[PDB]
Amino acid sequence: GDALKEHASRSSRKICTIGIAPWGVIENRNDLVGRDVVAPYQTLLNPLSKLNVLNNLHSHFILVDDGTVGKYGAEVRLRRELEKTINQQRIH
Amino acid sequence: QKSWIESTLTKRECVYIIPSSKDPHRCLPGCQICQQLVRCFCGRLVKQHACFTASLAMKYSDVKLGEHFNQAIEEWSVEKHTEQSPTDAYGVINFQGGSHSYRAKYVRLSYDTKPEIILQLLLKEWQMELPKLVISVHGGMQKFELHPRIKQLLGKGLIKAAVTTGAWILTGGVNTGVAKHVGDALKEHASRSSRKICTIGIAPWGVIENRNDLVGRDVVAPYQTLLNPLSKLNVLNNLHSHFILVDDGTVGKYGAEVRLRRELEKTINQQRIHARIGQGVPVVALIFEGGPNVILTVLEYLQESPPVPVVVCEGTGRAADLLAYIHKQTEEGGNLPDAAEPDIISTIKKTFNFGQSEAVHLFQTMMECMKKKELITVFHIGSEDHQDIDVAILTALLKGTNASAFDQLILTLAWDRVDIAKNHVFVYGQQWLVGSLEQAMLDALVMDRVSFVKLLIENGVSMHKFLTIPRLEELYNTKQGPTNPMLFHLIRDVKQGNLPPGYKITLIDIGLVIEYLMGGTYRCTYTRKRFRLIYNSLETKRFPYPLNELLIWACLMKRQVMARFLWQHGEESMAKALVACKIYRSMAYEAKQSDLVDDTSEELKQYSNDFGQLAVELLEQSFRQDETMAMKLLTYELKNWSNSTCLKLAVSSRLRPFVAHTCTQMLLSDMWMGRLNMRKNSWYKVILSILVPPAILMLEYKTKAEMSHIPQSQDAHQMTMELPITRKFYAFYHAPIVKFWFNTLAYLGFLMLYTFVVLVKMEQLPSVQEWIVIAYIFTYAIEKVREVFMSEAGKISQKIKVWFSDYFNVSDTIAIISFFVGFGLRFGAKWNYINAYDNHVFVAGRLIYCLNIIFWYVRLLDFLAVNQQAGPYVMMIGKMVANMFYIVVIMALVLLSFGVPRKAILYPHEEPSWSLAKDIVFHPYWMIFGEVYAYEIDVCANDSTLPTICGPGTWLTPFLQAVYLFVQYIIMVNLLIAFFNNVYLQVKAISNIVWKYQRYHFIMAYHEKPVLPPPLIILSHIVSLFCCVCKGPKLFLTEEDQKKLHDFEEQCVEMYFDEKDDKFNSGSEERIRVTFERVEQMSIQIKEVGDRVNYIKRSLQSLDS
Ligand SMILES: CCCCCCCC/C=C/CCCCCCCC(=O)O[C@@H](COC(=O)CCCCCCCCCCCCCCC)COP(=O)([O-])OCC[N+](C)(C)C
Ligand SMILES: CCCCCCCC/C=C/CCCCCCCC(=O)O[C@@H](COC(=O)CCCCCCCCCCCCCCC)COP(=O)([O-])OCC[N+](C)(C)C
Ligand SMILES: CCCCCCCC/C=C/CCCCCCCC(=O)O[C@@H](COC(=O)CCCCCCCCCCCCCCC)COP(=O)([O-])OCC[N+](C)(C)C
Ligand SMILES: CCCCCCCC/C=C/CCCCCCCC(=O)O[C@@H](COC(=O)CCCCCCCCCCCCCCC)COP(=O)([O-])OCC[N+](C)(C)C
Ligand SMILES: CCCCCCCC/C=C\CCCCCCCC(=O)O[C@@H](COC(=O)CCCCCCCCCCCCCCC)COP(=O)([O-])OCC[N+](C)(C)C
Ligand SMILES: CCCCCCCC/C=C\CCCCCCCC(=O)O[C@@H](COC(=O)CCCCCCCCCCCCCCC)COP(=O)([O-])OCC[N+](C)(C)C
Ligand SMILES: CCCCCCCC/C=C\CCCCCCCC(=O)O[C@@H](COC(=O)CCCCCCCCCCCCCCC)COP(=O)([O-])OCC[N+](C)(C)C
Ligand SMILES: CCCCCCCC/C=C\CCCCCCCC(=O)O[C@@H](COC(=O)CCCCCCCCCCCCCCC)COP(=O)([O-])OCC[N+](C)(C)C
Ligand SMILES: CCCCCCCC/C=C\CCCCCCCC(=O)O[C@@H](COC(=O)CCCCCCCCCCCCCCC)COP(=O)([O-])OCC[N+](C)(C)C
Ligand SMILES: C[C@@H]1CC[C@@]2(OC1)O[C@H]1C[C@H]3[C@@H]4CC=C5C[C@@H](OCCC(CO)CO)CC[C@]5(C)[C@H]4CC[C@]3(C)[C@H]1[C@@H]2C
Ligand SMILES: CC(C)CCC[C@@H](C)[C@H]1CC[C@H]2[C@@H]3CC=C4C[C@@H](O)CC[C@]4(C)[C@H]3CC[C@]12C
């Protein structure tokens, strides 16, 4: 992300970054909730904690509902498959 | 005394006359010399005391008989034996020097003046702005010079630190040390910071060259700047602006500054740096090139409660290069390395000749200084340490003082230093409380600190959560920033004309101001039910779009740089720019209609046109990407701006470049068509179809998709769902292009009949032709009353006033009124005489008709003005009449200057008559138009047609007429040709814009005009009225189309800023200067490497042997 803002409004419509993160380690899991909502998510480092935030300069997210807060191991099974299924597509 | 200084501050004259130490010099008898040489321990020869009380002590022998028990000779005290008396000198010295007088000031206060009196002296008596920083430089005196590297830099940072922070630089002032380097740095940056840096020399009234020249109650003493040779005495350094000379003691003794200068360093800190801010004013100390009592002073400032931090610029001299290394051999706050007595006290013995008699005493002062190195900032020169000390001075106040980052941020905010905070306060790992960055945002907005608002938004302040009703209330009510006085003038004009005592402004009142400024039917969110209810009750207490509310704030507070910034954030950028244009335009108007002093009507009219241009430039950007989506932007309802459209907002502000833009003109052309595809069709098939109704069924109409960008009536958009036979007739007769030709043919047929009526003989009863003419004008007149009483603006007196601003509506009004005067006289006239024209009332009626018809032929220019070529020329004709007025006035005067003499010479036997008025103007006018009256010029010639006019003096009239026509044709007619040739292009250009602009109101009018033309329009009046008793155009967009349009707007605004940054960063002027600056930088490093490689040559010597 920090590299995106140093080259933003030049590649802001060609680079589709994707965060395949879990629905575990994240600050406001409940603010992300809401069927078809436009949830106004924050970008302030919530102090007095270790929880992490979705990096603002990304464009797409695949949050993974499982488990709980704290456990963040359920991405390797899916993210890897995406790395396998894009390759079986024909480039052109 | 007529002066606060004269009644408050004092002198200290040594009344008591201690003889000098004890011993006379020479000269065996001890009565002359015990008087003469033997000075006072005061410090002057005996007669200079001039004691008003004891002036007759010296004549006797002296004050205080000799012996006096030696103990009691030191009993003299500055405190006791010194009459406190007035100042006797406070004024304005000057310095004949580097091309300026470089003026300054002195008070010459005593010494034991109270500390508060200085602050009162500095701020009101001298009228000095309280600073945001205080630099207290220190060091030793009378040193030669520095490295030419460091010398240039120390100023460059010292100046920069002081000018950007409104700082005071406390010096000794005397041009024999610290002050010299300060001053020498000032002249290298003078006439750039000569009005922001208020240096102060708190020097004594002792060591100085001409103490007596500084004397003089309220004088402008012309003090010198030449180094008086054959001496050691010092001069006041010219480049200082203020002095506090300390009257005590004598010449030579220079120790009475520490008691006062230090107090000033203590009393400024107890002042609050700013009203909104609670932190005290900081004090810093830059020691360069110091001495032994400095090392005492450094530790005296660090040990202080609270500590005053310290800067040390290594290499300037002893104390700097010393301390820079003496607090390098240490733990962070603890102990020294392997026993450091030898090497440390070595240099302390070498720099200061001690020999262990005073070599531990300094080292003991050192080991106390290293207990706090966090406050001893040290500017490591060579390795680009903190870049030109300004960081090093300022960050020293931000290095360890256990001050929260909230206090580290406000201090940058008061200084207006963003680079410091971003690089040294918003550092990785930094941690913040919950509303600390909120309180910092409130301060930055109230203080108009625009660049700190940016820093806080980026770092993560959220305006959706920050902005609230009570905060946003405050932002209007603050008097702690660059306010607008005129806002109250608009509030008190909407409230009731009055105001309560303090009147904390409410947001409903702001809502009322905006409605007054935005005008029309604008209704603001602040005057709505829900806001009016909830505000009474004062998330609910937040705002959905906070940057729409702050843009309004910044524009009503006349805070333009904040307005431009806030504009670039959020959505609806083109709309916000057009609202800002309208707010400022209306503010500029009421400023032009208020008896205040600072008119601010060109500042506001310029701010309006700045946002006006932004809207125009965003439209062009959008139009270059997609014409059809750009036309939608003009007409979508906004819903945050009273359900208006961007085009209506621009029309409201009379913004012609927006309305005359080709995108807006393309849309207006498409609305002119209606559902008709007038690309596949021709104007003669439209006219054919108005006369042949069944030909309506063989025109090329437009699909609902081709109409997607076009606003429509509700009834017109429901018939888009499919095209059946009857829907197609609707599409035809409701198109504005059809209503035009349908009214244009009826008007032409109206003129043909009315021309027939006036040209053909008139009988008692009106003919069928004349009846049809009357019906047209009657119904045409009702049609105009409909247009006025259904226009836009509610207020009749505004509806009236706008409609009578158009040329042709004034003429139509005169035309309609004059016609029915004529019909009344024509029709109401009783024929007593059988031969018409015996009845004068009838004649006056008919002659009104024959003159009223002129109005109706000229109205054809309004129809012709619908053409793109013709219409501008019609507008030009009126503009050229206005502009040619004074040339024509001069021609009228030349005409009379000829006409009056001609008539007087040729007709000398006339009695008074109104024919005289005719005869002086008649023939001279027709001469302008090619009629010289050839056989009337010389009335005494054989071929004359006026032989009876031949008489005395008549030979003069040909000379007069020859002069007259020379002046009219050869000069005045050709001046007018030259006038028109030279103003043509600028008038044509203005007329095209005005033509294009007035095309909005013309096309919009034909959407509300009835289908039927003015003779048959009565049905559309009666029917429509009656159907209403039995019971504007909008763009309709799907939710997905609203999505894709809001995204289109955002995309094109982003392109707009990118193409500007890339157009400016790619210009040659910008590449030359970045090239310039980078070549400037290299030219240092090239030489710097040049020095290093020349010192790797030192290697070659040592390495090879
Ligand atoms: C049946 C018959 C009965 C009645 C018959 C009589 C009816 C009379 C009919 C009169 C026509 C009425 C038209 C008035 C239009 C007003 C609205 C308008 O646009 O005004 C504008 C134009 O300025 C004017 O309109 C001022 C008057 C213009 C002159 C009109 C009559 C001239 C001919 C009389 C010749 C007499 C000759 C006598 C000797 C031979 C307002 O001004 P502006 O545009 O802001 O201008 C700014 C100028 N600037 C650019 C320098 C800044
Ligand atoms: C927004 C701008 C546009 C709208 C403006 C609209 C309003 C503008 C204003 C309009 C009014 C203009 C003046 C009217 C005439 C009065 C003057 C006069 O001389 O009258 C004469 C006729 O007197 C009669 O009674 C016979 C005329 C019948 C009425 C026709 C005029 C009124 C219609 C209005 C239609 C327009 C209404 C439009 C729809 C409501 C009286 O003289 P006499 O008796 O013949 O002679 C006596 C001598 N004798 C012995 C020789 C006989
Ligand atoms: C290049 C070609 C030109 C050459 C120039 C040489 C000049 C030589 C000068 C000649 C003047 C003498 C000629 C006329 C003889 C006197 C009596 C007489 O007949 O008077 C006649 C009029 O005229 C006058 O009464 C006086 C005319 C003087 C003006 C002449 C032009 C002066 C130069 C230029 C001035 C401009 C400014 C100059 C400076 C810049 C009588 O004529 P009438 O009207 O029929 O009257 C009789 C009928 N009644 C009895 C009923 C009244
Ligand atoms: C600053 C510049 C100066 C310009 C030059 C000086 C000015 C010109 C000088 C002219 C010479 C002077 C003429 C005197 C003639 C006297 C004769 C007489 O009897 O009276 C005549 C004088 O009375 C008039 O009224 C006519 C005057 C001539 C007007 C010329 C205007 C044209 C200007 C031209 C400018 C272009 C100049 C071109 C370049 C040179 C009238 O005659 P009458 O009334 O018929 O009398 C009865 C006679 N009959 C019985 C025979 C019919
Ligand atoms: C409001 C909107 C109107 C729209 C028009 C449609 C409605 C109106 C249409 C027609 C009305 C005709 C009424 C005729 C009445 C019968 C008697 C008569 O006048 O006979 C005349 C024959 O007729 C002519 O000489 C024609 C006169 C009208 C000329 C204009 C018609 C063309 C414009 C409109 C049409 C084309 C449209 C053009 C534009 C594309 C003979 O002359 P007189 O008059 O008997 O002589 C009087 C002599 N006296 C007074 C001394 C005694
Ligand atoms: C806003 C409203 C303003 C106007 C209000 C209404 C005004 C009404 C005005 C006038 C009404 C007059 C009524 C009659 C008065 C008594 C005289 C009489 O009856 O007969 C006499 C009429 O002699 C004339 O000269 C009449 C002239 C009047 C018309 C003036 C029109 C002004 C309108 C201007 C335009 C305004 C435009 C306004 C818009 C811009 C004589 O008739 P006779 O018996 O045949 O005598 C034969 C004599 N003989 C022997 C010589 C042959
Ligand atoms: C029964 C009767 C049967 C006959 C009925 C039919 C008869 C004919 C009827 C009418 C005559 C006009 C016909 C020609 C039209 C041409 C088409 C055109 O482009 O028009 C334009 C004219 O737009 C107007 O508004 C013109 C106004 C016409 C009236 C003015 C007459 C002046 C007379 C005073 C002189 C005295 C002369 C007096 C003579 C005695 C409109 O197009 P545009 O807006 O310019 O387009 C530009 C934009 N674009 C580039 C995107 C395209
Ligand atoms: C029967 C006789 C023949 C018939 C007549 C022929 C028909 C009549 C002919 C031409 C009429 C042209 C129509 C007007 C065109 C539009 C102009 C307009 O909108 O406003 C103009 C105002 O206008 C004026 O100031 C005056 C307009 C012209 C009046 C001319 C009257 C005729 C006589 C006069 C001579 C009498 C003296 C001689 C007497 C010896 C704008 O000018 P502006 O202020 O610079 O621009 C601001 C515009 N804005 C506000 C929109 C931004
Ligand atoms: C400023 C210089 C000084 C003036 C003198 C020099 C000027 C040059 C020349 C000479 C002047 C004219 C003299 C000749 C005519 C005399 C004969 C005569 O009677 O003529 C006439 C009258 O004439 C007069 O009464 C004279 C009026 C002179 C007015 C001033 C002229 C302008 C000078 C401005 C110069 C500026 C030049 C241009 C700018 C560079 C005809 O009268 P009558 O027919 O005999 O009367 C019988 C009447 N009865 C039948 C009823 C009974
Ligand atoms: C700046 C300009 C300087 C010149 C000028 O404008 C301004 O100064 C004006 C003064 C006017 C005269 C004043 C009074 C009368 C009396 C009247 O007596 C009725 C007689 C009869 C009618 O038939 C009764 O039956 C007749 C008209 C007359 C002579 C005026 C004529 C025009 C004059 C000369 C005008 C001229 C154009
Ligand atoms: C003083 C009165 C009694 C004598 C007649 C006055 C003259 C000058 C009047 C009578 C009719 C008038 C015309 C009537 C209509 C128009 C059309 C308008 O768009 C411009 C002015 C213009 C062109 C008028 C100019 C002046 C006018 C010609």
PDB file of C-alpha atoms and ligand atoms in Angstrom, chain B residues 909 940 950-956 959, ligand 9:
ATOM      1  CA  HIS B 909     -36.872  88.553 -40.118  1.00  0.00           C
ATOM      2  CA  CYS B 940     -27.782  84.578 -54.798  1.00  0.00           C
ATOM      3  CA  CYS B 950     -30.697  86.493 -51.411  1.00  0.00           C
ATOM      4  CA  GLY B 951     -29.605  89.225 -49.057  1.00  0.00           C
ATOM      5  CA  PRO B 952     -26.787  90.634 -46.967  1.00  0.00           C
ATOM      6  CA  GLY B 953     -24.441  88.130 -45.396  1.00  0.00           C
ATOM      7  CA  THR B 954     -25.828  85.170 -47.329  1.00  0.00           C
ATOM      8  CA  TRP B 955     -22.453  84.662 -49.028  1.00  0.00           C
ATOM      9  CA  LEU B 956     -21.293  83.215 -45.681  1.00  0.00           C
ATOM     10  CA  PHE B 959     -18.361  78.522 -46.327  1.00  0.00           C
TER      11      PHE B 959
HETATM   12  C1  LIG C   9     -11.381  87.824 -38.997  1.00  0.00           C
HETATM   13  C2  LIG C   9     -10.894  88.692 -40.119  1.00  0.00           C
HETATM   14  C3  LIG C   9     -11.460  90.099 -40.065  1.00  0.00           C
HETATM   15  C4  LIG C   9     -12.705  90.311 -40.910  1.00  0.00           C
HETATM   16  C5  LIG C   9     -12.419  90.921 -42.265  1.00  0.00           C
HETATM   17  C6  LIG C   9     -11.670  90.005 -43.211  1.00  0.00           C
HETATM   18  C7  LIG C   9     -12.448  88.766 -43.587  1.00  0.00           C
HETATM   19  C8  LIG C   9     -12.387  88.437 -45.067  1.00  0.00           C
HETATM   20  C9  LIG C   9     -13.118  89.382 -45.952  1.00  0.00           C
HETATM   21  C10 LIG C   9     -13.846  90.428 -45.691  1.00  0.00           C
HETATM   22  C11 LIG C   9     -15.053  90.600 -44.840  1.00  0.00           C
HETATM   23  C12 LIG C   9     -16.268  90.804 -45.731  1.00  0.00           C
HETATM   24  C13 LIG C   9     -16.288  92.121 -46.493  1.00  0.00           C
HETATM   25  C14 LIG C   9     -16.893  92.031 -47.884  1.00  0.00           C
HETATM   26  C15 LIG C   9     -18.383  92.289 -47.924  1.00  0.00           C
HETATM   27  C16 LIG C   9     -18.742  93.762 -47.791  1.00  0.00           C
HETATM   28  C17 LIG C   9     -19.888  94.194 -48.697  1.00  0.00           C
HETATM   29  C18 LIG C   9     -21.232  93.780 -48.186  1.00  0.00           C
HETATM   30  O1  LIG C   9     -22.122  94.541 -47.916  1.00  0.00           O
HETATM   31  O2  LIG C   9     -21.318  92.442 -48.075  1.00  0.00           O
HETATM   32  C19 LIG C   9     -22.558  91.853 -47.568  1.00  0.00           C
HETATM   33  C20 LIG C   9     -22.747  92.270 -46.123  1.00  0.00           C
HETATM   34  O3  LIG C   9     -21.501  91.972 -45.449  1.00  0.00           O
HETATM   35  C21 LIG C   9     -21.314  92.469 -44.225  1.00  0.00           C
HETATM   36  O4  LIG C   9     -22.117  93.156 -43.653  1.00  0.00           O
HETATM   37  C22 LIG C   9     -19.970  92.074 -43.680  1.00  0.00           C
HETATM   38  C23 LIG C   9     -20.015  91.003 -42.599  1.00  0.00           C
HETATM   39  C24 LIG C   9     -18.635  90.522 -42.180  1.00  0.00           C
HETATM   40  C25 LIG C   9     -18.654  89.487 -41.078  1.00  0.00           C
HETATM   41  C26 LIG C   9     -17.286  88.947 -40.684  1.00  0.00           C
HETATM   42  C27 LIG C   9     -16.680  87.997 -41.709  1.00  0.00           C
HETATM   43  C28 LIG C   9     -15.974  86.772 -41.132  1.00  0.00           C
HETATM   44  C29 LIG C   9     -14.475  86.926 -40.953  1.00  0.00           C
HETATM   45  C30 LIG C   9     -13.777  85.643 -40.515  1.00  0.00           C
HETATM   46  C31 LIG C   9     -12.499  85.314 -41.284  1.00  0.00           C
HETATM   47  C32 LIG C   9     -11.924  83.947 -40.923  1.00  0.00           C
HETATM   48  C33 LIG C   9     -11.278  83.166 -42.057  1.00  0.00           C
HETATM   49  C34 LIG C   9     -11.341  81.662 -41.843  1.00  0.00           C
HETATM   50  C35 LIG C   9     -10.519  81.132 -40.687  1.00  0.00           C
HETATM   51  C36 LIG C   9      -9.070  80.991 -41.034  1.00  0.00           C
HETATM   52  C37 LIG C   9     -23.687  92.171 -48.510  1.00  0.00           C
HETATM   53  O5  LIG C   9     -24.463  93.294 -48.047  1.00  0.00           O
HETATM   54  P1  LIG C   9     -25.197  94.204 -49.132  1.00  0.00           P
HETATM   55  O6  LIG C   9     -25.839  93.311 -50.118  1.00  0.00           O
HETATM   56  O7  LIG C   9     -24.276  95.267 -49.598  1.00  0.00           O
HETATM   57  O8  LIG C   9     -26.367  94.810 -48.232  1.00  0.00           O
HETATM   58  C38 LIG C   9     -27.559  95.363 -48.849  1.00  0.00           C
HETATM   59  C39 LIG C   9     -28.738  95.051 -47.965  1.00  0.00           C
HETATM   60  N1  LIG C   9     -30.091  95.593 -48.395  1.00  0.00           N
HETATM   61  C40 LIG C   9     -30.421  95.185 -49.798  1.00  0.00           C
HETATM   62  C41 LIG C   9     -31.146  95.048 -47.473  1.00  0.00           C
HETATM   63  C42 LIG C   9     -30.086  97.089 -48.313  1.00  0.00           C
END
